[PDB]
């Protein structure tokens, strides 16, 4: 569908489990779980162009892509990688990613838009997946 407008967090998974076996520190981690609980997210979705603006207290990030075009983000943990977005299903988008330098856990995220308008989230390490639900504002 179109998933453009504004995202509320209403359910959460594993995520703390998530920045845990990515090496992130314990007093990190609670001041990212924090943040994440409160989080906007702000989707402009042009056809298979994407504006996504994830805001937080500590972090906010910015990301724009095409589906399809290799593109540039960071991961979880910060490392910087090279990306890139497929479509898994009408509703379902995918994202391998690549570090750009070094070596590290296998990581991706996928977003998908159910018929019920919720947003899911997976983003995964290795064998360690996080989930998280968003309904449109
Ligand atoms: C398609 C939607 C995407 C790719 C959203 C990505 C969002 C993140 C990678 C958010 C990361 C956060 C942290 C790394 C700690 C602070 C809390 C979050 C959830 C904003």
């Given at each position: ?127 360690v ?7 449109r504002?």
């Amino acid at each position: 569908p179109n998933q453009s407008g504004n995202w509320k967090i209403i359910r959460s998974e594993n995520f703390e489990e998530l920045l845990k076996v990515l090496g992130v520190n314990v007093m990190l981690r609670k001041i990212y779980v924090a943040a994440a609980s409160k989080q906007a997210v702000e989707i402009k979705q042009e056809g298979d162009t994407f504006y996504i603006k994830v805001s937080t207290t500590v972090y906010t990030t910015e990301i724009n892509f095409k589906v399809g075009e290799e593109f540039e983000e960071q991961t979880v943990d910060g490392r910087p990688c090279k990306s890139l977005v497929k479509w898994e299903s009408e509703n379902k988008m995918v994202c391998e990613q690549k570090l750009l330098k070094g070596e590290g856990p296998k990581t991706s995220w996928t977003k998908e838009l159910t018929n019920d308008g919720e947003l899911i989230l997976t983003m995964t390490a290795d064998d360690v997946v996080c989930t998280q639900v968003f309904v449109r504002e």
